[PDB]
Amino acid sequence: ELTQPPTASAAPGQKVTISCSGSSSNIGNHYVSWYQQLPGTAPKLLIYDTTVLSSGIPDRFSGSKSGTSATLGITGLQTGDEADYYCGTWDELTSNLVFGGGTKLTVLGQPKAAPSVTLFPPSSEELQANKATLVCLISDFYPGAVTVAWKADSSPVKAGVETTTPSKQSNNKYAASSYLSLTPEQWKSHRSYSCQVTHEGSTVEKTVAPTE
């Protein structure tokens, strides 16, 4: 029964506020707490008892409560603040601890980064076990929009293609993976296989051959 805006946006050095909206039964009456969840990590306490900063949290972060609305304040916005932010309090109507839906905080004007693409062919071990997986790994790119296509002798191949959702790294760049599952025969049959990674109009294609 706590409501935040799903997304928040601002540029480096700017002030961004994340509103947590509720009623008199939660925010209006009880003490609010904010949490910061960086990609892949567990939630970390930002602010407790409405205004008090947790250990290590810089003064850039501020907690407010005006009527039925709790406001998380972030001044001098830095890219290291990109995270999901959750408000938490006690709701009187229910008999439980409540959380807001969460607010994804994007930091705008981050520098465009061309992806680093690495294509590995099937390992000796896998081919010995009568399987062939081409592993295309894509790292250190921004923004997070990439597409991975596979060619076999410059012919488009769709069967066996499994691609991960592009996910944010620890340094705020994005990482993706693509897998082309084959039999050892299909691998050795064709002259070459290619991982075509498209990012911001431009395409990085890496090739591997069964005859190394």
Binding site: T50, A129, E162, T165
Partner: protein, 219 residues
């Protein structure tokens, strides 16, 4: 720091006991809580337990089915999860709950993924992604480990037992049309080093209680 264990695969209508050990402070004289986070979705409180006795409070979602307790000796917090369904599929965190002025959790554990699904646990097949002097070399050579056909999530990968961290990215897993997961972990290293240096990826699959140390050698 707190650390949870027990996370793994359970069938609809199945049962699981989650553990949480306190490495520093005692559990018997602090208010302990469990919080869960379903994939994609936000934070949701599960249960809380006060210091004096094992009289716990549960969220409306988990009341009855779930039973919180602590072994009074060796700072151990348990969560008995019974009559589980797909909706309970989430990362479960143990944590200290402060309840003097405001209700908030200041200490959090790493968390452990519970997956409710009608499928079998499968340990990973780990294959080395050998470094070459072509596609795996961009000024510095890149090598990795392929962690293929495992269920459920998660797996974690360190390198040389955590002695190697700089250059490491462990990628997200993808659920293949087979209903089995694949993920990779590479490390970028100066090409000069390859020959000398020994490379072991430490693949961890707690849901199947499997640990694979795979040696990645120059092909």
């Amino acid at each position: 720091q707190l650390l949870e264990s027990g996370g793994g695969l359970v069938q609809p209508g199945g049962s699981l006991r989650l553990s949480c050990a306190a490495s520093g402070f005692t559990f018997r004289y602090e208010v302990a809580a469990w919080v869960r986070q379903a994939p994609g979705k936000g934070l949701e409180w599960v249960s809380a337990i006060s210091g004096p006795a094992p009289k716990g409070y549960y969220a409306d979602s988990v009341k009855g089915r779930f039973t919180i307790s602590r072994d009074n000796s060796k700072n151990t917090l348990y969560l008995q999860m019974n009559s589980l369904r797909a909706e309970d599929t989430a990362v479960y965190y143990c944590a200290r709950l402060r309840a003097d002025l405001g209700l908030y959790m200041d200490l959090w554990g790493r968390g452990t993924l519970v997956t409710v699904s009608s499928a079998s646990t499968k340990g990973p097949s780990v294959f080395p992604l050998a470094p070459s002097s072509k596609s795996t070399s961009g000024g510095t050579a890149a090598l990795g480990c392929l962690v293929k056909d495992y269920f459920p999530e998660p797996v974690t990968v360190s390198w040389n037992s955590g002695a190697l961290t700089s250059g490491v990215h462990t990628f997200p897993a993808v659920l293949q049309s087979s209903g089995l997961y694949s993920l990779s972990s590479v490390v970028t290293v100066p090409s000069s080093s390859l020959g000398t240096q020994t490379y072991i990826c430490n693949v961890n699959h707690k849901p199947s209680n499997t640990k694979v140390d795979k040696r990645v050698e120059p092909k």
